[PDB]
Each structure stands twice: as C-alpha cells, then as structure tokens.
C-alpha cells in the first residue's frame, strides 16, 4: 500500500497524515509519503487535503504541476481522495472563488450554505450508502458540494440543510470533514480507504 | 442536528498536568499527551489545555505541549492561558492547535479576535470570558479574575461576537471550585445575546449537573475535575443525557 498525501497547502496537513499513519500500522507493507512534486510511479492511495480558500490549493496545485499527477490515478484506475477543502476541489467550481475552476473529477460545483453560523463546526452525524462507517464526525467548513444523487456517498444535515458530506464517483472519494479530529470513527473510516484502495 | 459536546480541561504547567487549587500543594498528575489521549479513548468530544507556566518559560512551553499533543491526538483542542498577540497565536495554530483562547488580551484588544479570525477563521478562536455578580450586575473579570473591568457580560458577548469568534468559554468565577453544578443562570443569561457555541465552565459534579447545564443552553459543557479519578465515566454521562433529551455524540 502505497500512499500518497498532497502536503503542499493550505493549512495544515500532518494532522491527516499523522491520522494516516495511526489508521495504517496494522496492514502489510505501507508506505506513506508527502507529495510537493509530480513522482515518476502513482500511489494507490492519494489523498487531496487543504483547509482553507477553494481558489489558493487550486493554485498551489497548478503551481507545482499535481493535476496532471492526481488524474493520471483517476485513469490508471488508482484511489484519490479529497478531504475538507481537499473534497471540495475535487468538483468544477465554486463560489468560494468565482472564474476559478478546478479539476472538475467529479460533475458539480461548490456554494456557501445557507447558515447564519456558517463556520459549520462541530461533530454532526454521517451516514453512508455504503462502506464507511456511519457516526460522527468532525465538520468545520462553510461550503458545500451541490452534486447529483448517484455521486453522493454520505450525508449529514446543519441547520436544517440536507448536503453530501461524502462523495464518490468510482475510486474517486470526497470526504468534508476531518478524521483525523474524529477519533475512533475516524480512524475506522481511514482504515476502510486504505481496505478500498488495497484490491485492485 | 450539531451534536452536544463534553470537554476535558487538561490545566498544565511546565508542560505537565497540574492537580490542586493553590501553588502550595500542586502536585504532578501526569503527561498531558498521554492524559490527553486517555480523555479521547473514553470518548471526550475536545480537549482545552490552559497553561500556566511562569511568564518567562511560557511561550516556549506552550508550543512544546502543542506540539507534543498534534502528534499523537485525534480530536480538536484548543490551547489557552497568557496569549497576549496575534503572532503568539500564529505560533501555537500553525504548531498544531485547533483553536486558541484568549481573554485578558481580548478584552484589553477586542481587534485582537478580528486578527485570528481573518487570518485563521472564526473557528480558530475561542473567547473566554470570566464573569461575576458584582451589585447586582453580571461583570467581566480579567488578569485571572482579579480585575473588575466594569464591562458587562451583556455587551461584551454581543461585542465578542461582533469581532469575529467562533466560540465562547463562559467560566462563572462564583462557581469554581465549586461541585454543586455549572452557574446555569449565568447560562440562560448569554444565550440570547449571542448564537455563539457556549461552553459551559466552572461548578461540575454529577452527571445531572452536564444536563441541568445543557437545559440551560450551553452547546459543550467543560471540566476538569471529575473525568479523572473515574468519578463520571464520560460513556455513563453520554447515555445519560441521551436518555432524557440532550443531543449527544454516541458512538455504537
């Protein structure tokens, strides 16, 4: 299992791979590393993290030339996985940044919900199609994926606002909050990526 | 719905864990990291550490226990005590902390939250806030709840929010130290003046006290005391609170 987390910005990063490397320890044969540069071989595992502005992280991907990267696992039919900000980039746009687009892996765009306590934080309640396990977890994020109901993985409501808080379009997934602030959950739901992305 | 969250506060000095009321009779109750950890493998939903550590050693120490912490801790934590400026809370964020407190500086600062905010998000603040009956006003305290800063808690909740935090930490300082339940009343007061996160702190002693503070209209309830010398065990009190209405974080 070779795995790969984007470390190159915004926010912080080695919490997730820290998490990445507790949820790891019981599978044979893993390697993480922290991916700034295009590396010749893929990972079967790439996660896309990032905190922070959808329009910088789409710029700190292009400026080190990861795109290229991150879709050659999507055709070489490897995992990729985005996490918070990370989730987000991984559909077209968003209003977060307006003429900015962004890897466009998955049909949708990205909007600011509709809260008036809008950093979303806290642990809200996950639950899944399939797979992952459902519980909750650690939300602080103040947009939203608006996509179509067969890439949706797992939703969670705030505010009375229904929203994909897990997506999946193949070995594509997207995951808005953070497990590594998720405890015990978050581990188990860390573990099942890292089971997902071990048969091929 | 946002779940209810129930909150350790680890106090540390020289980056250890402190156990006592007066620097007479402090004593070494252990490591914050693996006390920490112990909090998450019994299902605490965020951790505060406040430091105290001498003046002189403090901002080094504090970023020691962030540190420390960020590598081995799987939940939010928040750091605090003495954070006096914006890049002393750059330091501890980008170090490994979740949210930083602030009190004494942000009264004496009120654009000092607006700072974090901007750069880190509302979610990277806490405001705490210390508050007393004094003739019959709800005051805010400073330097440890030693200085009257003849502010009321009604505007300053209203201003806090109006500077950018994400999150308030309301000690009642007429209730600490105290085991007969969180200052409930003082509760009720601020929940209408702001739609911040309340953590409830300060008067915590049985279960019953978590659900007479989350009637009242915290959002967490916070405590040192009890979890610890396994008085409340944290599971118990979760079920507890489920039962009779408080929307709990309950894993299977």
Same mark, same amino acid.
């Given at each position: 299992?070779?795995?790969?987390?984007?470390?190159?910005?915004?926010?912080?990063?080695?919490?997730?791979?820290?998490?990445?490397?507790?949820?790891?320890?019981?599978?044979?044969?893993?390697?993480?590393?922290?991916?700034?540069?295009?590396?010749?071989?893929?990972?079967?595992?790439?996660?896309?993290?990032?905190?922070?502005?959808?329009?910088?992280?789409?710029?700190?991907?292009?400026?080190?030339?990861?795109?290229?990267?991150?879709?050659?696992?999507?055709?070489?039919?490897?995992?990729?996985?985005?996490?918070? =900000? /990370?989730? $987000?980039?991984?559909? *077209?746009? !968003?209003?977060?940044?307006?003429?900015?687009?962004?890897?466009?892996? +998955? #049909?949708?765009?990205?909007?600011?919900?509709?809260?008036?306590?809008?950093?979303?934080?806290?642990?809200?309640?996950?639950?899944?199609?399939?797979?992952?396990?459902?519980?909750?977890?650690?939300?602080?994020?103040?947009?939203?994926?608006?996509?179509?109901?067969?890439?949706?993985?797992?939703?969670?409501?705030?505010?009375?606002?229904?929203?994909?808080?897990?997506?999946?379009?193949?070995?594509? =997934? /997207?995951? $808005?909050?953070?497990? *590594?602030? !998720?405890?015990?959950?978050?581990?188990?739901?860390?573990?099942?990526? +890292? #089971?997902?992305?071990?048969?091929? | 719905?946002?779940?209810?969250?129930?909150?350790?506060?680890?106090?540390?000095?020289?980056?250890?864990?402190?156990?006592?009321?007066?620097?007479?009779?402090?004593?070494?109750?252990?490591?914050?990291?693996?006390?920490?950890?112990?909090?998450?493998?019994?299902?605490?939903?965020?951790?505060?550490?406040?430091?105290?550590?001498?003046?002189?050693?403090?901002?080094?120490?504090?970023?020691?226990?962030?540190?420390?912490?960020?590598?081995?801790?799987?939940?939010?934590?928040?750091?605090?005590?003495?954070?006096?400026?914006?890049?002393?809370?750059?330091?501890?964020?980008?170090?490994?902390?979740?949210?930083?407190?602030?009190?004494?500086?942000?009264?004496?600062?009120?654009?000092?939250?607006?700072?974090?905010?901007?750069?880190?998000?509302?979610?990277?603040?806490?405001?705490?806030?210390?508050?007393?009956?004094?003739?019959?006003?709800?005051?805010?305290?400073?330097?440890?709840?030693?200085?009257?800063?003849?502010?009321?808690?009604?505007?300053?909740?209203?201003?806090?929010?109006?500077?950018?935090?994400?999150?308030?930490?309301?000690?009642?300082?007429?209730?600490?130290?105290?085991?007969?339940?969180?200052?409930?009343?003082?509760?009720?007061?601020?929940?209408?003046?702001?739609?911040?996160?309340?953590?409830?702190?300060?008067?915590?002693?049985?279960?019953?006290?978590?659900?007479?503070?989350?009637?009242?209209?915290?959002?967490?309830?916070?405590?040192?005391?009890?979890?610890?010398?396994?008085?409340?065990?944290?599971?118990?009190?979760?079920?507890?609170?489920?039962?009779?209405?408080?929307?709990?974080?309950?894993?299977?």
């Amino acid at each position: 299992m070779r795995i790969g987390i984007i470390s190159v910005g915004p926010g912080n990063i080695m919490n997730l791979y820290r998490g990445v490397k507790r949820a790891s320890e019981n599978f044979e044969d893993v390697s993480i590393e922290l991916v700034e540069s295009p590396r010749n071989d893929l990972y079967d595992l790439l996660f896309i993290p990032g905190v922070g502005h959808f329009g910088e992280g789409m710029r700190r991907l292009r400026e080190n030339d990861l795109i290229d990267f991150v879709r050659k696992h999507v055709e070489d039919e490897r995992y990729v996985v985005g996490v918070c =900000l /990370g989730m $987000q980039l991984l559909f *077209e746009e !968003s209003e977060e940044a307006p003429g900015v687009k962004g890897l466009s892996l +998955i #049909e949708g765009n990205v909007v600011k919900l509709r809260s008036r306590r809008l950093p979303h934080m806290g642990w809200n309640e996950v639950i899944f199609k399939d797979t992952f396990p459902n519980g909750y977890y650690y939300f602080v994020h103040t947009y939203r994926a608006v996509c179509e109901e067969e890439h949706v993985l797992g939703t969670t409501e705030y505010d009375g606002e229904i929203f994909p808080s897990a997506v999946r379009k193949g070995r594509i =997934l /997207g995951f $808005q909050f953070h497990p *590594e602030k !998720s405890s015990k959950i978050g581990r188990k739901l860390l573990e099942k990526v +890292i #089971e997902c992305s071990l048969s091929r | 719905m946002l779940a209810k969250r129930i909150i350790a506060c680890l106090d540390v000095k020289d980056g250890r864990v402190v156990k006592g009321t007066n620097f007479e009779n402090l004593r070494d109750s252990g490591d914050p990291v693996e006390l920490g950890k112990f909090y998450s493998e019994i299902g605490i939903d965020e951790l505060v550490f406040l430091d105290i550590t001498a003046s002189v050693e403090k901002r080094k120490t504090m970023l020691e226990l962030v540190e420390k912490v960020a590598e081995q801790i799987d939940i939010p934590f928040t750091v605090g005590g003495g954070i006096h400026d914006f890049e002393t809370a750059s330091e501890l964020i980008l170090r490994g902390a979740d949210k930083v407190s602030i009190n004494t500086a942000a009264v004496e600062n009120p654009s000092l939250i607006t700072q974090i905010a901007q750069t880190f998000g509302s979610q990277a603040v806490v405001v705490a806030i210390d508050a007393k009956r004094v003739d019959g006003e709800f005051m805010v305290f400073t330097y440890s709840g030693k200085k009257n800063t003849g502010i009321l808690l009604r505007d300053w909740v209203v201003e806090v929010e109006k500077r950018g935090a994400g999150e308030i930490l309301l000690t009642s300082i007429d209730r600490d130290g105290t085991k007969s339940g969180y200052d409930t009343e003082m509760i009720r007061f601020v929940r209408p003046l702001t739609t911040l996160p309340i953590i409830a702190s300060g008067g915590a002693g049985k279960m019953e006290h978590f659900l007479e503070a989350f009637l009242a209209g915290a959002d967490a309830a916070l405590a040192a005391s009890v979890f610890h010398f396994r008085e409340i065990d944290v599971r118990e009190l979760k079920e507890y609170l489920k039962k009779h209405g408080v929307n709990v974080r309950l894993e299977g």
